[PDB]
Design a protein around this ligand. Structure first.
Ligand SMILES: Nc1ncnc2c1ncn2[C@@H]1O[C@H](C(=O)NS(=O)(=O)C[C@H]2[C@@H](O)[C@H](n3ccc(=O)[nH]c3=O)O[C@@H]2CO)[C@@H](O)[C@H]1O
Length: 121
């Protein structure tokens, strides 16, 4: 799996919504609960073209100190998945929360594409 492909699997769910069951099902189907319960994960509902375009938008500092992060000029429809208190592997359990926020992604490679989801603001 390429880094670009991993980003698409972990963070992209293009749709033009999310039920209380959404994260429980999506974290499983996208193979994010295979080894452990991933505590926090965000899905983005805008088009792949729109998210890829963020790599040419506002340059901002990455949480890790690198300079290859970019913030979206427009807000984007997203869903945050957060592990519940009662959640126990292999039965990982999640709270589903919809939001409309600017996203921050890290980009790499040629083509220069998103490889990491840094934050929403
Ligand atoms: N500039 C870079 N350029 C290139 N690569 C970079 C760069 N920076 C990191 N990586 C890489 O990413 C890898 C990854 O393991 N780091 S991770 O912070 O823990 C991933 C998290 C984050 O996606 C997720 N989260 C978080 C908030 C939110 O709203 N939504 C949401 O989904 O939760 C995860 C845990 O935080 C690491 O191996 C490192 O090499």
């Amino acid at each position: 799996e390429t880094a670009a492909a991993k980003f698409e699997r972990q963070h992209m769910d293009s749709s033009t919504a999310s039920s209380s069951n959404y994260c429980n099902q999506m974290m499983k189907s996208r193979n994010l609960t295979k080894d452990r319960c991933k505590p926090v994960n965000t899905f983005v509902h805008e088009s792949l073209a729109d998210v890829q375009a963020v790599c040419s938008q506002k340059n901002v500092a990455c949480k890790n100190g690198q300079t290859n992060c970019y913030q979206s000029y427009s807000t984007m429809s997203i869903t945050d998945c957060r592990e519940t208190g009662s959640s126990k592997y292999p039965n990982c359990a999640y709270k589903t929360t919809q939001a409309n926020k600017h996203i921050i992604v890290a980009c790499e490679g040629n083509p220069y594409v998103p490889v990491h989801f840094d934050a929403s603001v």
